[PDB]
Write an enzyme that holds these catalytic residues in place. Structure first.
Site, short mmCIF file in Angstrom:
data_model
loop_
_atom_site.label_atom_id
_atom_site.label_comp_id
_atom_site.label_asym_id
_atom_site.label_seq_id
_atom_site.Cartn_x
_atom_site.Cartn_y
_atom_site.Cartn_z
N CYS A 43 -5.74 6.01 8.03
CA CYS A 43 -5.05 5.07 7.15
C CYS A 43 -4.03 4.32 7.97
O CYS A 43 -3.05 4.89 8.44
CB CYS A 43 -4.37 5.82 6.01
N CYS A 80 -4.64 -3.03 3.51
CA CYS A 80 -5.40 -1.96 4.15
C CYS A 80 -5.36 -2.19 5.65
O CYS A 80 -5.95 -3.13 6.16
CB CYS A 80 -6.89 -1.89 3.76
N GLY A 81 -4.66 -1.31 6.37
CA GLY A 81 -4.54 -1.44 7.81
C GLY A 81 -5.84 -1.28 8.59
O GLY A 81 -6.14 -2.10 9.46
N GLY A 86 -8.64 -1.66 7.40
CA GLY A 86 -9.49 -2.76 6.95
C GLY A 86 -9.18 -4.05 7.70
O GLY A 86 -10.09 -4.81 8.02
N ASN A 109 -13.00 5.53 9.27
CA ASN A 109 -13.52 5.36 7.91
C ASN A 109 -14.42 4.14 7.94
O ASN A 109 -14.29 3.27 8.81
CB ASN A 109 -12.37 5.21 6.90
N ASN A 131 0.93 -1.13 0.00
CA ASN A 131 0.00 0.00 0.00
C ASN A 131 0.97 1.17 0.00
O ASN A 131 1.49 1.54 1.04
CB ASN A 131 -0.82 -0.05 1.29
N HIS A 182 -16.26 0.51 6.88
CA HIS A 182 -15.82 -0.79 6.40
C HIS A 182 -17.00 -1.73 6.38
O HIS A 182 -17.81 -1.75 7.29
CB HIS A 182 -14.73 -1.38 7.30
N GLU A 185 -10.98 -0.92 -1.74
CA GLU A 185 -11.05 0.31 -0.97
C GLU A 185 -11.88 1.36 -1.64
O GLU A 185 -11.98 1.42 -2.85
CB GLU A 185 -9.67 0.92 -0.77
N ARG A 186 -12.43 2.22 -0.79
CA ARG A 186 -13.20 3.36 -1.24
C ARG A 186 -12.19 4.27 -1.89
O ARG A 186 -11.14 4.57 -1.30
CB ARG A 186 -13.83 4.07 -0.04
N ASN A 188 -7.08 10.13 -0.91
CA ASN A 188 -7.05 8.86 -1.64
C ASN A 188 -6.57 9.17 -3.05
O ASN A 188 -6.49 10.33 -3.45
CB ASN A 188 -8.45 8.23 -1.72
C1 LIG Z 1 -6.26 0.75 3.33
C2 LIG Z 1 -5.89 2.07 4.05
N1 LIG Z 1 -4.88 2.66 3.24
C3 LIG Z 1 -7.12 2.94 4.08
C4 LIG Z 1 -7.14 4.20 3.17
C5 LIG Z 1 -8.47 4.98 3.28
C6 LIG Z 1 -9.64 4.36 2.48
N2 LIG Z 1 -9.34 4.31 1.06
C7 LIG Z 1 -10.91 5.16 2.64
O1 LIG Z 1 -11.34 5.92 1.73
O2 LIG Z 1 -11.52 5.04 3.73
C8 LIG Z 1 -5.38 1.76 5.42
O3 LIG Z 1 -6.05 1.88 6.48
O4 LIG Z 1 -4.20 1.32 5.46
#
Ligand SMILES: C[C@@](N)(CCC[C@H](N)C(=O)O)C(=O)O
Ligand SMILES: C[C@@](N)(CCC[C@H](N)C(=O)O)C(=O)O
Ligand SMILES: C[C@@](N)(CCC[C@H](N)C(=O)O)C(=O)O
Ligand SMILES: C[C@@](N)(CCC[C@H](N)C(=O)O)C(=O)O
Ligand SMILES: C[C@@](N)(CCC[C@H](N)C(=O)O)C(=O)O
Ligand SMILES: C[C@@](N)(CCC[C@H](N)C(=O)O)C(=O)O
Lengths: 301, 287, 287, 287, 287, 301
Positions: D75, D230-231, D233, D164, D13, D166, D221-222, D66
């Site tokens: 993130c 995705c952390g 996530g 965010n 990522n 999920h 991911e959004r 993003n």
């Molecule tokens: C996967 C992510 N980069 C999350 C990025 C944000 C996600 N794309 C959103 O729009 O909520 C993380 O937590 O490591």
């Protein structure tokens, strides 16, 4: 080359002013978004320099869109190209209206309440895109114009004698916030052929006349019909401009007071026509005219 | 449409400079330039200058439109602004010179340490028919202190081209020296500009000699009127001053907006002009 | 270690350009290049391009490593970036052409006034064995609209080399025209790339004719996959289009990342490719 | 303009990290970020992360855009990169932890002795309307293994927020376990992301249980698509696994790019995520 | 008058660089240079370096005035600053090499990727009378570890010229190795500099061997005193170290201001020196 | 080359500082126009780097021309070459005066009021071009100098014993805003031959002496006559400079207190002479000396 630490540092102290250029019938101005404060972003001296047409941006003045006062939507302040600060500007307020509609992305008819040194002004963007403005009520009291001439019709100065450089002229004084001296000719003289006047020669004599403590704007008029007037103007601190909104309002007032024209006229200014109307119902003057954006930029300060 | 530009001025002779390095075709028409130059309804300038791609090996090419829309073959104050414009666009530092192709041939401006620009304005053209002028040469094929009847009055003029035409006068025929500031340019100027003896119209500079190395002038430009300065004009009047034996090849020329250093080298016949150039503001105009 | 480079892209075909004018040996290994090209764990690119010293009198030499580490003999979008790269390094403004030695021979890109680059891509190689391909020539020694059995399905292909191998197809044997966007490249592409009939693997371009001067395509590159554009591929497919009589020698080719102007001049048998090339960023990567 | 940055990646990522400690306002716009994140025309990344000045006493603040330009509230992989970034900028060696203000609240990453980063990812939000989701809570105010009709097909999902949104699913309603690698994310993913039941869109993670302490997943991911990890996530899916009674509070999560150690402490409701972060390159991009 | 210049320094050896590409004669006199170099009453520097027009085909020529006004024939730290200085005036980016004519002959600096400059310093002159020195050669025509009586004390020195004269010593005759930092340069230095055995005075470097590839030194320069570094001096001392059999041809030389990589290639007998060079400020000084 | 993201970011994050170089009898400074802010344009750390003579611009300090404070024309702040901030600078204020006169295009005699850390300082450009400065009144109270030495003549430390590295010296302490330790020799020793002193060796022992909490400037003096003194100085945070204006004032005060010289003296400093007068009339000290611009430029930060 000379060793000059002063010059060196001067050419270093930089500043930038973002603005949009507008013009109302040729009366062009530098409009700046000053809604972030009630204090003008630049000084009067800087404005004078920016207005120089060869060494600066070039304009008849700088207009600042300021935050409302006493509940008005906005406030407007303007600096003439000579740096002085007048209390109102007709062509300018029309540009101000369009400048606001652009900054707020407003479509169609819109009116705003503007606080000015002349009081409450209310412009309304018409459908044709033009702007009709409520210029307020005219001040006829001699001492409030201000003029040292004695009122010869009530407290108003109407077709009174004014000796300019030894020559007797007849003038009418009216204020639209700012002072105006309107003349339809010399005392005991014929009508004027406005285009035959040498403004840069005669203008300054009226502008700095001792009878006008705060100087004055001067408009020379020739009646074409009781509803059609032609004019030229020598503005206080701006010279011979292509148009003057407050001046067109003031000369219609003067024309009515002198009984030369009706309360609704079409005033032909060098840069174009304006529709003026002095509603007897409320004693308010309404001015309708165009306003256009030319370009936008950033100037060095 | 929109036109991005930067406003510059050389001693008050102000121009609209546009980056036109992507094409040999000016971004706007001459008619559009005329409108943009209107000082009240447009941006306001004495002309529009385009920085174009080089030609036949030059670093760049320059084309200019007068505020009336006509296209002259060179511009001295403008080429100085052109040099600084390039230096800014390319973020160049220090002394830099560029080869520029213009309607007058090769022109080479060089940015000096003090920030001014010394320009190799090329060589003066004196052959009457190449100026062009219909006056007859009275010194070889050159027109030097020759009689020109303007609106019924006899003036003495010298004609020289710097790519563009110039008519220089130090006074009326059989008249005294001029007090340039006493002239009514908007009145006398147009009579020279559109004179029948100048097929392509002409720029006119009125000069009063202060010393053999110090000249004061005023100019009525072809298609631009009474400007605060004219670089090609300052070069042409020094040439005329020399030809008439009124001054030396190296002079300081005082124009309404300030001085220019001019030198017409006999070693190679080229004329060098040194003067300032300053950016004023930059913007985008509606087209 | 550290690798200094500048990122460029030609119609989306992005590369890592490195100044290797100091040695005729690439600063990094092919393995390192493959890692640097990884888009998540590395810099991310379709390949690495080295600006090397000239060979046999050329101004420079170019070598490139695909994102998979293999070394192709030429790159059209890359050579356009190469030209602009040099220009930025040597402060070359305006039109400029350079002679470049590559694994395909001499290549001569020339920067245009608008910043695009028109490249002389040399002459095409059609002899089967030199493409190289094991398919037999069916038109002289050239393979034109010949049957190629891919995973049991018969396709018709034309083979041409621009230094590197290309397999162009306008559809299956006895099939209708292609709707290029309906193809599943990651599925069909690898079957062509590693086909037994292509000893050195091959680049594959799928084409759909829009007009005799307008072609649309998608490509599955040898060692780079489905890229947004391929310069040598656009040249090869026009050659194939002409040989198959489907288009004329001058075409506009629409690639996923944009258009290219291609022309196979019958006068000299040379192919000219014109297109953009833009700098994205410059940096240093850990090795 | 030009943007100086350092490229980092957490399990694939990858992000563009910028030192924005000098201002409270991001150096670039969301639109510019979207362009910079384009992998072929830009720098290429899943997002841009700004190191901003502390807020309400925190050591720093973090904001992220993003690759589509939208701004998420946290993130996980990014905050781990953020930790190394700061440590690198301040030249901090060894164990270190900083308080970071984010749109999800306080987040506290701590660099371990082995170099990995253990992060206090705050507490999970389970109240449906705060996730937010329009689905009705079926376990208190939380949505756990509730029916979600996606393009006419009934799936069972659990919703949890880590700042965010999920949406976690272990399979279709009344369906078997998932073979995550058999899913066609680019096809099914967008249907969850823009589902009408998720007002602010949502991140979606598909999970297959390997053991009560070992989970495998893939994520759509959004605004970023199918990333390698995705952390937030990984934290959310462990929460969901626990709520659905499929796994324990401490799990090893296998994401496409690698594993993460996740622990949802019943002791304080906080979730801790341990994983790597590595610098790849640095440079200056053109804006 | 006014002098425009740029201040640079190579490992602390700071110079005033002036663009003198306009004339083949230095813009200022040696006396003026001496005054400008005064650190309290002037700009302050170890010398003034002029970038002059090429000679016999070289890209440029370089002349330098010591802070005492004398003119040496070369300067190693200075030529590195010269290279980066020119790079700016030519708006060049990245690696680039220039041929420079100096009083020591052809010198070829080359900018590296890390911003450092590797310079081909030419071949060393060892013939005694050409150094020049009045000491007799004791090893061929070279003066190697020969006795030099300084103020009644016998020292052993090796003489070598890099265009300019250098007297290298590793200690007194029959004495132990030197602890360079324990020397009182302002006391011992002048005795070497103006020694009767050096007709044109000499630069003196005191050296202590750390290893056969690592040397530490201090220098008392002719007309400049105890500077923080001396490029030609570092080259000369490596030559001397090799001739005396104390070190290898490739060494890291530690100078007060920092390290330099020196290599006396046996292949061509040329000496290469790699070191940094940084701009400090731009200025205009009153003359 | 090592991969360093930090080093990379530091290098691209650079600024510029425009300044003019001046020097007062060899005591050279970097003057910056900071009249547009009450906060110094650069940090003390940056000043220290700019003052490095080989890696920077080179100077004994950086002087900022700041906006006036509570009724003064301007304010002055200075950073030593080591980065510390002293409360006043004599040679610097003279350079400050010419700097202002040059920036304001002031010709002839002119005086300005300057707010400093030592209070009100009033430099006045003379008709001969020199700058005569009203350096204020000296602070003699021991604890306010400051010094931990006990007063032995009222609250003042005059010719008192100071044990420096085991050797007994006699010193007099006086403050001109900044601390000064003046000595005419060791206790029970002969007069000094100032040029025979090894300042870099003895200086630091006084500068960081435990009896001076804020460190101190030290001036070594040898009397030539009751109106002619020769000195050398080891400044706090600047080392052995060619001159020190506050130091020359302080040593004249000390000389008077010790009864070695009159209140009007010509002081010879390494870089030249200064006229000093401690008026008994008002207890103010006046210092007259030169100041010269040398060059100007822009430094990378
Ligand atoms: C996967 C992510 N980069 C999350 C990025 C944000 C996600 N794309 C959103 O729009 O909520 C993380 O937590 O490591
Ligand atoms: C002519 C004017 N611009 C007036 C400008 C103000 C005038 N110059 C003044 O000083 O009274 C207007 O009303 O449109
Ligand atoms: C005065 C001028 N701008 C000339 C402009 C061209 C002129 N108006 C013409 O039509 O020849 C210059 O040389 O600097
Ligand atoms: C598409 C390509 N980049 C070709 C790259 C080389 C190709 N991947 C090969 O392996 O032959 C170009 O010509 O622009
Ligand atoms: C030390 C030096 N600057 C040499 C300067 C010239 C020297 N002072 C001399 O007079 O020979 C260099 O090579 O880098
Ligand atoms: C010598 C000095 N420059 C004083 C500078 C300040 C001194 N270094 C201190 O730290 O007090 C002056 O007065 O002219």
């Amino acid at each position: 080359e000379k060793f000059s630490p002063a010059s060196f540092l001067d050419k270093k102290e930089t500043g930038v002013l973002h603005f949009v250029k507008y013009h109302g019938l040729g009366n062009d101005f530098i409009l700046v978004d000053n809604r972030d404060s009630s204090e003008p972003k630049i000084t009067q001296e800087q404005a004078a320099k920016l207005c120089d047409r060869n060494f600066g941006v070039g304009a008849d003045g700088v207009i600042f869109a300021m935050p409302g006062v006493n509940g008005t939507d906005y406030a407007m302040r303007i600096f003439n190209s000579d740096g002085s600060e007048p209390e109102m500007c007709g062509n300018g307020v029309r540009c101000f209206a369009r400048f606001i509609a652009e900054l707020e992305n407003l479509q169609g008819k819109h009116s705003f309440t503007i606080h000015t040194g002349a009081g409450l002004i209310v412009p309304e963007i018409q459908d044709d895109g033009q702007v009709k403005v409520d210029m307020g009520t005219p001040i006829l009291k001699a001492q409030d114009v201000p003029t040292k001439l004695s009122g010869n019709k009530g407290e108003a100065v109407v077709e009174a004698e004014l000796v300019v450089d030894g020559v007797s002229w007849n003038v009418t004084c009216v204020s639209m916030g700012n002072p105006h001296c309107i003349t339809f000719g010399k005392k005991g003289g014929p009508n004027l052929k406005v285009d035959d006047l040498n403004l840069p020669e005669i203008g300054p004599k009226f502008e700095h006349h001792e009878m006008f403590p705060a100087r004055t704007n001067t408009e020379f008029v020739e009646v074409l019909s009781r509803s059609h007037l032609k004019m030229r103007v020598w503005e206080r601190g701006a010279g011979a401009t292509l148009a003057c909104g407050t001046g067109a309002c003031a000369l219609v007032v003067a024309a009515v007071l002198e009984g030369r024209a009706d309360r609704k006229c079409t005033v032909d200014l060098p840069g174009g026509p304006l529709e003026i109307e002095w509603k007897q119902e409320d004693n308010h003057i309404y001015m309708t005219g165009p306003a256009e954006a030319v370009f936008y930029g950033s100037a060095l300060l």
